[PDB]
């Protein structure tokens, strides 16, 4: 089997991407944030505290003839941005782009933190990291990809995120028309539950490539590119007037600037992030200070190849017995 679904930016900045997902019988379509940095499929629901729902579409398990309470199971998750959610668990039929999993754990939110409530466009998350990170207790549950894997034509999914435009998540096949050149594959460590890999270095603009190992995670659920402070300083030093602002929470730059590209290495291959992809717009409405799309990871504990990096590439998440990641230009 295969599936193919379009993923769409939630706003003009590509702050996140939503993909429609069918849950239950008859189908209830919710727009979920596919997140290769976590491993829970959770949704706003008829059980979510009413004051914490503000425009989201909800899953109502009592209206699904295939929903079953997973008795005794609860979940609770905290994300790197400080947001969180928790609740109980149903199993139900879940389909993405024509690919159907029966018995998928659908985690129904009873509580969500304010950043989720405030984002009316995101109806939940669909985790695509390794199932060892799933938070369901006392019986940990598998991700949608883990449940589908054995049925797929090939045990892979691909992320093809657009810049200010829709893109595609494919399951079970590699669309050879969706990228240019060849795909370069690189090793993955699953020891932390992430799609964790080591970039071979970077360049700023037309500058020379610096060969240096940068361990980090391919995370579709993080907006920006978080890298070591040395690398980030070298980037922003090429932008007149750019500076790190403690009050704003990272590097800002004059909105009048033209930003240089940023290149990262994948083995001997190179992925170029155009400068425009690094512009996240005014820090507040009408400001001439703009927020940078490359930020330091120094406070995180891990480097994160988020959407800013991933959208410059066609990315293969290879879930074979030994997982690997593939990157191609596009």
Residue 156: give its domain's CATH number: 2.40.70.10
Query: Can 92 be counted among the known catalytic residues?
Result: no
Q: Are residues 20 and 164 in the same domain?
A: yes
Residue 318: closest CA among 147, 167, 186, 160: 186
Q: How far apart are CA 32 and CA 221, in angstroms?
A: 11
Measured at the CA of 95, the angle between CA 144 and CA 120, to 5 degrees, comes to 85
Q: What is the DSSP letter of 80?
A: T
In DSSP notation, 127-164 reads: E-S-GGG---BSS----HHHHHGGGSSSSEEEEE--SS
Encoded tokens for 1: 């089997």
Measured at the CA of 160, the angle between CA 157 and CA 163, to 5 degrees, comes to 160
Encoded tokens for 24: 């239950």
Encoded tokens for 97: 């782009």
Give the residue from 154, 174, 194 where a domain finishes: 174
Residue 315: closest CA among 184, 192, 202, 160: 160
Q: Are residues 191 and 266 in the same domain?
A: yes
Residue 159, domain extent: 5-174
Q: How far apart are CA 159 and CA 295, in angstroms?
A: 22
The answer to whether the CB of 276 falls within 8 A of the CB of 292 is no
Give the residue from 116, 147, 174 where a domain finishes: 174
Q: Are residues 197 and 209 in the same domain?
A: yes
Q: How far apart are CA 170 and CA 151, in angstroms?
A: 14
Q: How far apart are CA 162 and CA 17, in angstroms?
A: 9
Q: Are residues 104 and 25 in the same domain?
A: yes
Query: Can 33 be counted among the known catalytic residues?
Result: no
As a 3-state breakdown, the chain gives helix, strand, coil percent values, each rounded to 5, of 10, 45, 45
Give the residue from 119, 154, 174 where a domain finishes: 174
Q: Are residues 158 and 190 in the same domain?
A: no
Catalytic residue among 14, 33, 35, 146: 35
The answer to whether the CB of 136 falls within 8 A of the CB of 73 is yes
What is the Cα 139 distance to its own chain's centre? 25
Q: Are residues 133 and 170 in the same domain?
A: yes
Number of domains in the chain: 2
Residue 240: closest CA among 253, 224, 252, 223: 253
Residue 189, SS3 per DSSP: strand
Q: Quick one: resolution in A? A: 1.1
Q: Are residues 208 and 87 in the same domain?
A: no
Catalytic residue among 199, 261, 296, 297: 199
Q: Are residues 289 and 147 in the same domain?
A: no
Q: Are residues 116 and 93 in the same domain?
A: yes
The answer to whether the CB of 172 falls within 8 A of the CB of 147 is no
Q: Are residues 158 and 195 in the same domain?
A: no
Q: Are residues 160 and 179 in the same domain?
A: no
Q: Are residues 318 and 203 in the same domain?
A: yes
Q: How many CA atoms lie within 13 A of 194 on its CB side?
A: 19
Q: How many CA atoms lie within 13 A of 89 on its CB side?
A: 22
């Amino acid at each position: 089997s295969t599936g193919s679904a379009t993923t769409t930016p939630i706003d003009s900045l590509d702050d996140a991407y939503i993909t429609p997902v069918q849950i239950g019988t008859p189908a209830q379509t919710l727009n979920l944030d596919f997140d290769t940095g976590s491993s829970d499929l959770w949704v706003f629901s008829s059980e979510t505290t009413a004051s914490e729902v503000d425009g989201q579409t909800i899953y109502t398990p009592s209206k699904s003839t295939t929903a079953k309470l997973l008795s005794g199971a609860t979940w609770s998750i905290s994300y790197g941005d400080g947001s969180s959610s928790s609740g109980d668990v149903y199993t139900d039929t879940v389909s993405v782009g024509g690919l159907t999993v029966t018995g998928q754990a659908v985690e129904s939110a009873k509580k969500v933190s304010s950043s989720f409530t405030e984002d009316s466009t995101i109806d939940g998350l669909l985790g695509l990291a390794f199932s060892t990170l799933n938070t369901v207790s006392p019986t940990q549950q598998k991700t949608f990809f883990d449940n589908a894997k054995a049925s797929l034509d090939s045990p892979v999914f691909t992320a093809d995120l657009g810049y200010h435009a829709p893109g595609t998540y494919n399951f079970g096949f590699i669309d050879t028309t969706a990228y240019t050149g060849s795909i370069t594959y690189t090793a993955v460590s699953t020891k932390q539950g992430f799609w964790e890999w080591t970039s071979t270095g970077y360049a700023v603009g037309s500058g020379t490539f610096k060969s240096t190992s940068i361990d980090g995670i391919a995370d579709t659920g993080t907006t920006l590119l978080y890298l070591p402070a040395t690398v980030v300083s070298a980037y922003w030093a090429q932008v007149s007037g750019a500076k790190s602002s403690s009050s704003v929470g990272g590097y800002v730059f004059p909105c009048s600037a033209t930003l240089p590209s940023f290149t990262f290495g994948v083995g001997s291959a190179r992925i170029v992030i155009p400068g425009d992809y690094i512009d996240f717009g005014p820090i507040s409405t009408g400001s001439s200070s703009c927020f940078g799309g490359i930020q330091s990871s120094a406070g995180i504990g891990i480097n994160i190849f988020g959407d800013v990096a991933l959208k410059a590439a066609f990315v293969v998440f290879n879930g074979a017995t030994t997982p690997t990641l593939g990157f191609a230009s596009k």
